[PDB]
Enzyme design. Structure first.
Site, PDB file in Angstrom:
ATOM      1  N   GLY A  19      49.746 -67.955  33.145  1.00 33.06           N
ATOM      2  CA  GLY A  19      50.937 -68.127  32.535  1.00 33.06           C
ATOM      3  C   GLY A  19      50.841 -69.549  31.992  1.00 33.06           C
ATOM      4  CE  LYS A  39      50.875 -66.871  40.695  1.00 32.79           C
ATOM      5  NZ  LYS A  39      52.125 -67.233  41.325  1.00 32.79           N
ATOM      6  CG  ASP A 130      61.540 -61.623  35.896  1.00 34.00           C
ATOM      7  OD1 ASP A 130      62.197 -60.831  35.047  1.00 34.00           O
ATOM      8  OD2 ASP A 130      60.637 -62.087  35.853  1.00 34.00           O
TER       9      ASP A 130
HETATM   10  C1  DB8 Z   1      47.253 -63.368  42.973  1.00 28.08           C
HETATM   11  O1  DB8 Z   1      48.778 -63.784  42.785  1.00 28.08           O
HETATM   12  C2  DB8 Z   1      49.477 -62.980  41.993  1.00 28.08           C
HETATM   13  C3  DB8 Z   1      48.912 -62.279  41.211  1.00 28.08           C
HETATM   14  C4  DB8 Z   1      49.783 -61.421  40.103  1.00 28.08           C
HETATM   15  N1  DB8 Z   1      49.096 -60.253  39.332  1.00 28.08           N
HETATM   16  C5  DB8 Z   1      48.510 -59.344  39.874  1.00 28.08           C
HETATM   17  C6  DB8 Z   1      48.348 -58.653  41.012  1.00 28.08           C
HETATM   18  C7  DB8 Z   1      49.414 -59.192  42.071  1.00 28.08           C
HETATM   19  N2  DB8 Z   1      50.162 -59.519  43.077  1.00 28.08           N
HETATM   20  C8  DB8 Z   1      47.650 -57.778  41.522  1.00 28.08           C
HETATM   21  N3  DB8 Z   1      46.649 -56.955  40.514  1.00 28.08           N
HETATM   22  C9  DB8 Z   1      46.711 -57.644  39.105  1.00 28.08           C
HETATM   23  C10 DB8 Z   1      45.647 -56.993  38.437  1.00 28.08           C
HETATM   24  C11 DB8 Z   1      45.751 -57.609  37.173  1.00 28.08           C
HETATM   25  O2  DB8 Z   1      44.863 -57.069  36.276  1.00 28.08           O
HETATM   26  C12 DB8 Z   1      44.391 -55.429  36.110  1.00 28.08           C
HETATM   27  C13 DB8 Z   1      44.044 -55.052  35.085  1.00 28.08           C
HETATM   28  C14 DB8 Z   1      42.925 -54.355  34.793  1.00 28.08           C
HETATM   29  N4  DB8 Z   1      41.576 -54.768  34.514  1.00 28.08           N
HETATM   30  C15 DB8 Z   1      41.514 -56.358  34.279  1.00 28.08           C
HETATM   31  C16 DB8 Z   1      40.222 -56.937  33.701  1.00 28.08           C
HETATM   32  N5  DB8 Z   1      39.820 -56.209  32.429  1.00 28.08           N
HETATM   33  C17 DB8 Z   1      38.610 -56.816  31.915  1.00 28.08           C
HETATM   34  C18 DB8 Z   1      39.673 -54.910  32.467  1.00 28.08           C
HETATM   35  C19 DB8 Z   1      41.195 -54.210  32.896  1.00 28.08           C
HETATM   36  C20 DB8 Z   1      46.541 -58.681  36.555  1.00 28.08           C
HETATM   37  O3  DB8 Z   1      46.271 -59.067  35.280  1.00 28.08           O
HETATM   38  C21 DB8 Z   1      47.103 -60.128  34.966  1.00 28.08           C
HETATM   39  C22 DB8 Z   1      47.122 -59.279  37.471  1.00 28.08           C
HETATM   40  C23 DB8 Z   1      47.456 -58.863  38.766  1.00 28.08           C
HETATM   41  C24 DB8 Z   1      50.937 -61.467  40.132  1.00 28.08           C
HETATM   42 CL1  DB8 Z   1      52.274 -60.835  39.147  1.00 28.08          CL
HETATM   43  C25 DB8 Z   1      51.668 -62.705  40.953  1.00 28.08           C
HETATM   44  C26 DB8 Z   1      50.886 -63.205  41.991  1.00 28.08           C
HETATM   45 CL2  DB8 Z   1      51.380 -64.485  42.805  1.00 28.08          CL
END
Ligand code: DB8
Length: 284
Positions: A19, A39, A130
């Site tokens: 972000g 994160k 949201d």
């Molecule tokens: C850790 O903290 C937080 C993490 C998140 N967000 C995510 C959560 C959760 N939870 C879980 N799983 C996620 C997976 C993601 O990628 C999956 C995409 C598959 N591949 C990626 C790499 N490429 C090369 C091939 C395809 C992703 O991408 C941005 C964000 C995720 C939130 Cl929204 C809030 C908090 Cl606080």
């Protein structure tokens, strides 16, 4: 209840999102070799955001549902905060939309799982605030979970309504924009906009400036789903998008809506959508 020394328990792998509060990383739980999402927030480049960070972690730590991103913990490392979540490798519902349209079976299936999350959240007197396709994440096998509790709210016995202006403009309920006293019924409006988003690819008004949208939504008649879609899908949307929040059904009631009952199938069928995105992205 914060914990310390994250790199003892976890391995930080490569960056996968950002972000501008902080960045999100793939990672490994070295106790199980499960993959996690990490994160990291530099507690310096944010200040006003600190209170919203604390609320998010609180909400996450109190949720225990297969329909809500599992929370491992928050870890302090010098000036950094590490938030550790389960990793969901299937991308978001928004990603799944990018290669092209969904059919009503896929739409109903996804909506049904979101409804299970909302039912869980609302039974715990939490409001997500949201709800939108981008905040609906999938496992590589099609499990569907609510994510991003950055503006989630908590009702209590002394506070039975909320008043805060939060959300994403296109998906926001009119009572939230007006900053009236509102509750979980606001998530049900956002769900209706999300159903249109799953159906059409985009929420109503999506080509307009978000600020303009803030005055249009309270004044205008509610959106409806236009186009060649089944009557029950159109009624599901209409049920959700009532200007009067007490006339919106609960999540529990919507789980029994004809559209859901008639069209939702096994989540494992959603792997087809996951494969489609991967193919689409690779040839991008
Ligand atoms: C850790 O903290 C937080 C993490 C998140 N967000 C995510 C959560 C959760 N939870 C879980 N799983 C996620 C997976 C993601 O990628 C999956 C995409 C598959 N591949 C990626 C790499 N490429 C090369 C091939 C395809 C992703 O991408 C941005 C964000 C995720 C939130 Cl929204 C809030 C908090 Cl606080």
């Amino acid at each position: 209840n914060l914990k310390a020394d994250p790199e003892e328990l976890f391995t930080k792998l490569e960056k996968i999102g950002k972000g501008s509060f902080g960045e999100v990383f793939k990672g490994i739980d070295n106790r199980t070799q499960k993959v996690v999402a990490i994160k990291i927030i530099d507690l310096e480049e944010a200040e006003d955001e600190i209170e919203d960070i604390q609320q998010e972690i609180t909400v996450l730590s109190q949720c225990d549902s297969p329909y809500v991103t599992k929370y491992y913990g928050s870890y302090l490392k010098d000036t950094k905060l590490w938030i550790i979540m389960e990793y969901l490798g299937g991308g978001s519902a928004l990603d799944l939309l990018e290669p092209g349209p969904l059919d009503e079976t896929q739409i109903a299936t996804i909506l049904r799982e979101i409804l299970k999350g909302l039912d869980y959240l609302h039974s715990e007197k939490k409001i997500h605030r949201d709800i939108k396709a981008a905040n609906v994440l999938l496992s590589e096998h099609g499990e569907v979970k609510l994510a991003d509790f950055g503006v989630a709210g908590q009702l209590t016995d002394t506070q039975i309504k909320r008043n805060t202006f939060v959300g994403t403009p296109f998906w926001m309920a009119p009572e939230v924009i007006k900053q009236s006293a509102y509750d979980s019924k606001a998530d049900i409006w956002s769900l209706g906009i999300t159903a249109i988003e799953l159906a059409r690819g985009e929420p109503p008004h999506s080509e307009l400036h978000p600020m303009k949208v803030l005055f249009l939504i309270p004044k205008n008649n509610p959106p409806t789903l236009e186009g060649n879609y089944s009557k029950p899908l159109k009624e599901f949307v209409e049920a959700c998008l009532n200007k009067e929040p007490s006339f919106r059904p609960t999540a529990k009631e919507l789980l029994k809506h004809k559209f859901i009952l008639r069209n939702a199938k096994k989540t494992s069928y959603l792997t087809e959508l996951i494969d489609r995105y991967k193919r689409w992205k690779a040839e991008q």
